[PDB]
Amino acid sequence: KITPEELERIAGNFKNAAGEAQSQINRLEGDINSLEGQWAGATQAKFRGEFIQSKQAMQQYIPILEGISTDLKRIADKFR
Amino acid sequence: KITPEELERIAGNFKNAAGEAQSQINRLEGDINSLEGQWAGATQAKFRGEFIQSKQAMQQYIPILEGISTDLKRIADKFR
C-alpha cells in the first residue's frame, strides 16, 4: 500500500515545515540580538510583554522538538 | 527580569532542537530514498513496519511544525 514515493513527498513536506520553523526562529533571534546594543538606555517596560511571550513560546516548543528528534531517530534506527 | 541576553541563550537551544529535528528527518528520508531502487520482494515486506510508523509520525508532526513557524512568525512580526 505505502510506497517509498509517497513517503518521499511526505518527507519533503516535513523538511519544508521544519525549515520554515528554523527560518522564523532565525528571524526572532535576529531581532533580539539587535536589541542588545541599545538595551541599556531602552525602556524595558514596553518590551516586557513580548519578552515573556517569546520566552514562553520557545521554552514550550523545545521539548516538543526534542521528542520529535528522538521519535524520528528511533524509526531511523530500525533501518539498521 | 528577562534580558535579550537570556532570550539569546534560549533561542540557541531552540535552534539546536529544531536542527536535530531536521537532522533526523534527513536521515529517515535518506533511508526511504535508498529503498526506491529495490522496492521489490522481500524488501517491501521487511520494511512495511517502518513505513507505517514513518507515515503516521511525519503526517502528525507536519501541522505541529507549521504551528510553531506560524507562532514565531507572528511574534517576530510584533517585534516590528
Describe this protein's structure:
The PDB classes it as unknown function. The entry lists the keywords Structural Genomics, PSI-Biology, Midwest Center For Structural Genomics, mcsg, unknown function. The assembly is dimeric. The crystal structure of a secreted protein EsxB (wild-type, C-term. His-tagged) from Bacillus anthracis str. Sterne. Two copies of one chain form a homodimer. With 80 residues, the first copy, chain A, is mostly helical. Chain A has one domain: HP0062-like domain (Helix Hairpins, Orthogonal Bundle). The first copy, chain A, is built from two helices and no strands. The first copy, chain A, is elongated, with a radius of gyration of 19 Å. Chains A and B meet through α1 and α2 of A and α1 and α3 of B.
Could you give a short description of this structure?
The structure is a homodimer of 80-residue chains. Chain A is mainly alpha-helical and 80 residues long.
- So what's the CATH class of chain A? Mainly Alpha
Helix content of chain A: over 70%
User: Please, how many domains of chain A?
Assistant: 1
DSSP, total strands of chain A: 0
- Count of DSSP helices of chain A? 2
CATH homologous superfamily designation of chain A: HP0062-like domain
The fraction of residues assigned to DSSP E strands of chain A is: under 5%
| CATH-defined fold name of chain A | Helix Hairpins
Key features of this structure:
T7SS_ESAT-6-like (chains A, B), ESAT-6-like protein (chains A, B), HP0062-like_sf (chains A, B), Helix Hairpins, 80 residues
Task: Indicate the topology.
The structure is a homodimer of 80-residue chains.
Chain A: H1 4-38, H2 45-75
